[PDB]
Structure formats: C-alpha cells, structure tokens
Design a protein around this ligand. Structure first.
Ligand SMILES: [Cl-]
Lengths: 127, 155
C-alpha cells in the first residue's frame, strides 16, 4: 500500500503521533516520505546483511526478527512491519526515538526534514 | 579536509564562510553521508545567495544524491521559488526523475506549491510522467484533495 500524504497524516494522527513527546505530526510524515516514499511495502537490504522494513524503514539488526540476520527490541517479526496497517511500525518507531537521543536517530528525518518547515507536510489536510 | 566544512557552511547559510572556504580550494562537489552536495543542502535550506555562489564556482547543477534527487527536486518540494528559477536558468533538468521516478513536478504538487508548479509547467514539465507507483502530478493533487492544484494541472 502506498499512502497519500494527507492519508498518512490522518492515520498517524489516529495512532498517537500528533501528541508524542513534542515530535509534531509533520516530523513523522516527512520522515516516512524520505524513508519509504509512503510505501508500507518498502524493503531495502543494508550493506551489513540487515534489512530495513516498512514505511519507516525499521532496521532488522536491532528492532525486529527476520530469521536471517537477534535483538528484536520491538518484540515483533520484521514481516509485521509490512502490512497496510501501520500500528506495528508506529509502536516500534515510538520505542526507537524514546531512548533519549530522540529524532536524531532518524537518518532520513535528520538529512531531509530537520531544519525545514515540517508543518508543511500536514498543511492542506483536513485533520 | 575542507569539503566536510563546506557542506556544513552551505546547509547552515553561512554566506561569508562559504566564500572563504571556496577561495581556499575546497571541493565544491563534496558529498556527505546522504550523498548531498553543497548545492543540495543550500537548496534544501532555502539559501538563495549560497546557491548562486556555488553555481559560479562550478557546482554540478544536476548532481544526484543517494536517492537520485537533484537540487531542483529539493527546491521545488520545499517551495523555494527564487532558487527554482536560478536552478532552471543554470541548466537544471526540469524533468529529472529520482530513484522512485518522481519529478520536480511531483514533489511540488505533493506539497501544494501552486506558484512552483506553474513555473515548472512553463519550463516544460511533463504532466504525464509517473513515479514507480504509476502516479502523475494530477493523481497526487486528487489524493490530497487539492482542487486549486488540480485546476492548474488540468490545463
Ligand atoms: Cl508525551
């Protein structure tokens, strides 16, 4: 499934991302755009043998279990991050940023969202 | 070791530090972790004056980052109209497609930048171009329910 921008903003709002730790909703929509281009099916194998899964490209070395990489800190099979329901990816994403270092753990957000007008990513959506 | 410092200066809008690093033989096409050139970062952060200085010093106007985005991709999506024209007049491909097949027209349409869409159309933006998901700029405007943008693209 490939989300539209406003469609994913509305879905992320339903999953508790417009009121999470000061990380306003636009930050998350922008991050999903540059991580996966709004594609929940996106999968990219890293140079170290691990793979990034899902709409927020969650890495399989640390956060999920794919059977070909054993930390699984989100206690989830990596395949579960690929469905059209974004519950699994969001809950895992909330665990990644909540260690203290925050959004700077998000490579695509850090390089393409951080410092821009992130509110534009929810601009024009009737939420 | 100056290229890493020119990247920082370009993204940060240090108009004066960009000049000094340039004259001292800093690589105007240095790449960071994401494959961005100084011209990428200056267009991303809306620093018009640094964009012109990098172009005068021979920056690649169509350099692609690790995902295939050109500086015109980033300027069009962020709504920086001044930079988009400077990039076009200096030989930027108005119909460049990145790794997911998105053009500058796709990126400006996704964020409802009407004025930038019209400038891109004027410079020959292809309204039939599709990303890897089969979407045109028109389809994007419909998905986002942007009626004013749809009208622009319908003619
Ligand atoms: Cl909170």
């Amino acid at each position: 499934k490939v989300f539209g921008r406003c469609e994913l903003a509305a879905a992320m709002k339903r999953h508790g991302l417009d009121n999470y730790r000061g990380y306003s909703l636009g930050n998350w929509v922008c991050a999903a755009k540059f991580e996966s281009n709004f594609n929940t099916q996106a999968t990219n194998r890293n140079t170290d043998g691990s793979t990034d899964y899902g709409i927020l490209q969650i890495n399989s070395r640390w956060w999920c279990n794919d059977g070909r990489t054993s930390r699984n800190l989100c206690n989830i099979p990596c395949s579960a991050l690929l469905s059209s329901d974004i519950t699994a990816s969001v809950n895992c994403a909330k665990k990644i940023v909540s260690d203290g270092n925050g959004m700077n753990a998000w490579v695509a957000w850090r390089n393409r969202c951080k410092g821009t007008d992130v509110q534009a990513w929810i601009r024009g959506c009737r939420l | 070791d100056l290229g890493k410092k020119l990247l920082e200066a370009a993204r940060a809008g240090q108009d004066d530090e960009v000049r000094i690093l340039m004259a001292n033989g800093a690589d105007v096409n240095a790449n960071d972790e994401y494959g961005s050139t100084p011209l990428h970062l200056a267009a991303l952060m809306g620093h018009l004056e640094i964009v012109e200085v990098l172009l005068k010093n021979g920056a690649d106007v169509n350099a692609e980052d690790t995902v295939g985005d050109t500086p015109l991709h980033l300027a069009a999506s962020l709504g920086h109209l001044e930079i988009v024209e400077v990039l076009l007049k200096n030989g930027a491909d108005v119909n460049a497609q990145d790794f997911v097949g998105a053009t500058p027209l796709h990126l400006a349409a996704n964020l409802g930048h009407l004025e930038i869409v019209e400038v891109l159309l004027k410079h020959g933006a292809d309204v039939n171009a599709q990303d890897k998901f089969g979407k045109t700029a028109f389809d994007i405007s419909i998905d986002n329910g942007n009626e004013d943008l749809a009208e622009i693209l319908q003619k």
